[PDB]
Design a protein around this ligand. Structure first.
Ligand SMILES: C[C@H]1O[C@H](O[C@H]2[C@H](O)[C@@H](O)[C@@H](O[C@H]3[C@H](O)[C@@H](O)[C@H](O)O[C@@H]3CO)O[C@@H]2CO)[C@H](O)[C@@H](O)[C@@H]1N[C@H]1C=C(CO)[C@@H](O)[C@H](O)[C@H]1O
Ligand SMILES: C[C@H]1O[C@H](O[C@H]2[C@H](O)[C@@H](O)[C@@H](O[C@H]3[C@H](O)[C@@H](O)[C@H](O)O[C@@H]3CO)O[C@@H]2CO)[C@H](O)[C@@H](O)[C@@H]1N[C@H]1C=C(CO)[C@@H](O)[C@H](O)[C@H]1O
Ligand code: NA
Length: 827
């Protein structure tokens, strides 16, 4: 006949029981053989009838007790089955098992009543979820977030999860710790956020070369616009990945384009690494500079000019950089670098920040519209609280600085939350003015002289003018060069200053390119304290009148001077095709200094309302504008397909490294067809395009996997979150995925790469001593290619452990290791 034996699983395989690599979860569901509402009648289940494992099986009697009470006190009481707040109140872990199981069974009869009554298992599912949050052990809090709600676990080897084992996982082998011989030092840590990819794994390192080759040939390989090919890379999280891959990328690029001897070929394939750590400069220098180093002078800029209060003194613009500009009168000596006033991450750090001020760390609903209104309202004020002061002055410094490839932020030229390029920012005129002036005037040596604690003169001596005493070698010498005068004190007394324009600019006239007034900036001298033109004396000294002002554009002083000319000039230096040093890839000099990068996106860029609004399409339409502005090198957003639930849908939350969008499923930026065209439009204007390559993480991978984990700090060593920790734990992490793109293109070009450039696969990597391995292709990511994950908000108590200490297990398809062990209550 019938009975409670019907609580067994219908069958002990995946078809009737949820599992992940054979293991069961307390959030899992299974198909009993039958259920009952009263005790007497038992209905054989259909394959559509599933119930939560937490109705039948518990981690401990304590939790079994709390499951019964919480359900009774949330509408599953029924006195006719001895279930009232009163009848369950006194139950405890020391209550008899035989008794507790009688109660849980009787609760199970009422649950079945609710299911029929409400015609679904939905309120039940919702109740289970809520119950789990009350149990510290099963809750997401058991994975031990740190004080700021962050943290990560590492994937370690384990006899239960041996399919996820790795011989590699060499963590924090970054920068100057590639060999693992200075773990304690200035190296930059392994973990940032998301599922961390193991870039020490020879197969992964081979997959990166594949990926890079796909992107350097994107349009050709995809049969889109065949000139729609990236020329180089912008390297995300370069301080946070085994530095082997920065070596390897540079090797591939030198193999493909012959960059080492040829400054022309190098400079046509610019690469730049994100990461200001001074140690990175050191590292890149020792290596012959395969990529540009990311300088910190933008932080100096914000601290000296951008703050409302607490403004670091003016002389920090001279020394507050990987390059000292006291008197920089030499070439090929500075660390080849890229610098900026702003990037995507600085805006975010401000916008988040406004988000927690306005709304007390609460339900993070989308009142990022409110944070943005506040930003835009503050951006226009003279007395700003949040936004940056002196934005034009900062770009004046950035754009006149020798030995750097400067980087403009889309967001500083355009209102980044409006549709792409639909709204210019109030700073567009100023910045673009200075950008054009750079092309025409900014070359030669540099001298930054202090004149007070608040006032500086940054002079460039002009093309082919090495220093203050030089005569002039080029025929643009006389009519090029610039003086940038910046005061960071808005109450600075009016006064007269002297500026040495060099011995090659005696009795020369100077245009007042840009000057400060009561209201802002004037481009023709109207409203300022200086005339449209001034002249130098015999020794090349310029008298200028300066004063403190306070308006939305300037808090202090900004003035800029350039030679009078009747013509357009362009002071770029072509790279000659024979490097002063054949050990170098990149060299800091006039040729490299003639480059300028544009960051073409913001995280808060909105979803396009239509195809006409795809950033890719609008870029293709405005390529000549970018060229006019003096931009040579385009940094394009990570173009990869994203996690559906990502906050900003921005490119950094990667589910498919090869799907750059299709016509019906574009990214925020557009389709791959449209990307390839956008790239080709830029090429058509003589620009180059670099892609943002994200080797560090993947996010929103839909496949769960039973892995074994240790709560670890961000370098990869275990850590204690205030007393507590845990190691060698079963965790049901999202680790597996990649999409058709990883399946279709994974490892596909390694044959071609090997035949064309064998050295890639015989050169031994520093961190491993072993060459990249092209003999396995990665067509799907999983835990075995991953160091770990940022805390996934799941919990560490989900894996069902039998009373005897062993994890519950099921022999299934992939699952074919040990013997099937199921709880007493489900078999
Ligand atoms: C991972 C997250 O941030 C990434 O940018 C990182 C830098 O790559 C990282 O080095 C770090 O900053 C500095 C580093 O601490 C230091 O050692 C070195 O001297 O200089 C580094 C350069 O700044 O922190 C920033 C972030 O603040 C990438 O931009 C993204 O991968 C990612 N950004 C976002 C995106 C998403 C998803 O769309 C979020 O999930 C993520 O939380 C968020 O930060
Ligand atoms: C519907 C409309 O919206 C489109 O914008 C898209 C993005 O291009 C796309 O990335 C997609 O992004 C992710 C989204 O944030 C996330 O919530 C979801 O779960 O996953 C998506 C991909 O991972 O969604 C945004 C919008 O949220 C384009 O701008 C439009 O072309 C697109 N077309 C629609 C609407 C119109 C407009 O009239 C029709 O003409 C068109 O036929 C229709 O397909
Ligand atoms: Na990493």
């Amino acid at each position: 006949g019938p009975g409670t034996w019907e609580n067994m699983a219908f069958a002990q395989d995946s078809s009737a029981i949820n599992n992940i690599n054979g293991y069961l979860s307390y959030t899992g569901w299974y198909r009993p053989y039958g259920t009952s509402q009263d005790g007497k009648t038992w209905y054989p289940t259909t394959v559509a009838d599933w119930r939560p494992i937490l109705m039948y099986v518990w981690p401990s009697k304590d939790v079994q007790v709390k499951f019964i009470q919480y359900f009774v006190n949330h509408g599953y009481e029924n006195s006719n089955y001895g279930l009232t707040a009163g009848s369950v109140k006194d139950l405890s872990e020391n209550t008899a098992s035989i008794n507790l199981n009688e109660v849980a069974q009787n609760l199970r009869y009422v649950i079945e009543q609710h299911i029929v009554a409400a015609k679904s298992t939905s309120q039940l599912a919702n109740d289970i979820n809520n119950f789990i949050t009350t149990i510290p052990e099963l809750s997401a809090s058991s994975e031990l977030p740190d004080e700021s709600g962050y943290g990560q676990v590492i994937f370690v080897n384990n006899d239960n999860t041996s399919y996820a084992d790795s011989k590699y996982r060499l963590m924090s082998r970054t920068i100057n710790n590639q060999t693992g011989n200075d773990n304690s030092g200035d190296n930059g840590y392994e973990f940032l956020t998301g599922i961390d990819i193991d870039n020490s794994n020879p197969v992964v390192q081979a997959e990166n070369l594949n990926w890079e080759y796909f992107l350097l040939n994107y349009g050709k390989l995809m049969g889109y616009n065949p000139d729609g090919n990236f020329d180089g890379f912008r390297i995300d999280a370069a301080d946070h990945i085994d530095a082997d891959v920065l070596d390897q990328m540079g090797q591939l690029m030198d193999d493909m384009y012959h960059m080492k001897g040829n400054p022309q070929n190098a400079n046509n394939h610019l690469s730049y690494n994100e990461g200001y750590r001074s140690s990175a400069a050191r590292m890149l220098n020792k290596k012959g500079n395969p990529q540009l180093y990311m300088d910190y002078v933008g932080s100096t800029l914000g601290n000296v000019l951008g703050r409302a209060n607490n403004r670091d003194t003016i002389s920090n613009l001279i020394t507050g950089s990987i390059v000292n500009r006291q008197n920089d009168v030499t070439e090929n000596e500075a660390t080849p670098n890229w610098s900026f006033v702003t990037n995507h991450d600085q805006r975010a750090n401000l916008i988040n920040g406004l988000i927690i001020k306005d709304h007390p760390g609460a339900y993070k609903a989308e009142y990022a519209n409110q944070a943005w209104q506040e930003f835009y309202a503050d951006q226009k004020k003279t007395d700003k609280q949040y936004a940056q002061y002196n934005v034009p002055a900062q770009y004046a410094i950035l754009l006149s600085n020798k030995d750097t490839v400067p980087q403009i932020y889309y967001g500083d030229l355009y209102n980044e939350t409006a549709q792409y390029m639909q709204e210019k920012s109030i700073y567009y005129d100023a910045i673009t003015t200075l950008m054009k002036a750079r092309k025409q005037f900014v070359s030669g040596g540099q001298t930054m002289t202090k004149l007070s604690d608040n006032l500086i003169a940054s002079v460039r001596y002009g093309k082919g003018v090495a220093n203050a005493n030089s005569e002039g070698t080029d025929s643009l010498s006389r009519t090029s060069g610039m003086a940038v005068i910046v005061g960071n004190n808005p109450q600075m007394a009016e006064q007269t200053i002297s500026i040495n324009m060099g011995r090659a600019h005696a009795n020369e006239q100077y245009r007042n390119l840009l000057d400060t007034t009561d209201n802002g900036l004037t481009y023709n001298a109207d409203g300022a304290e200086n005339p449209e033109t001034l002249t130098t004396d015999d020794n090349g000294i310029l008298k200028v009148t300066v004063k403190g002002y306070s308006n939305p554009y300037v808090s202090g002083y900004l003035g800029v001077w350039v030679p009078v000319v009747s013509v357009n000039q362009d002071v770029t230096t072509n790279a000659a095709t024979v490097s002063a040093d054949s050990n170098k890839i990149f060299e800091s000099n006039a040729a490299l200094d003639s480059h300028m990068i544009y960051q073409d996106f913001s995280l808060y860029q909105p979803e396009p309302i239509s195809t006409e609004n795809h950033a890719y399409n609008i870029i293709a339409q405005n390529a000549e504008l970018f060229n006019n502005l003096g931009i040579t090198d385009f940094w394009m957003a990570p173009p990869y397909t994203q996690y559906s639930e990502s906050r900003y849908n921005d490119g950094y939350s990667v589910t498919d490294r090869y799907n750059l969008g299709t016509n019906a499923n574009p990214t925020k930026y557009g389709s791959g067809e449209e990307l390839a065209n956008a790239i080709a439009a830029l090429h058509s204007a003589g620009l180059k395009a670099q892609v943002d390559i994200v080797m560090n993480q993947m996010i929103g991978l839909p496949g769960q996997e039973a892995v074994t984990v240790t709560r670890a700090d961000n370098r990869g060593m275990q850590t204690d979150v205030n007393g507590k920790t845990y190691a060698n734990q079963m965790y049901f992490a999202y680790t597996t995925g990649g999409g058709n793109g990883q399946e279709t293109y994974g490892g596909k070009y390694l044959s071609e790469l090997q035949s064309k450039y064998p050295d890639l696969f015989t050169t031994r990597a520093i961190s491993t001593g072993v060459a990249p391995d092209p003999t396995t292709h990665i067509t799907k990511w999983s835990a075995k290619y991953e160091n770990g994950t940022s805390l996934q908000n799941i919990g560490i108590g989900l894996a069902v452990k039998l009373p005897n200490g062993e994890y519950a297990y099921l022999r299934s398809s992939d699952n074919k290791s040990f013997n099937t062990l199921l709880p007493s209550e489900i078999s």
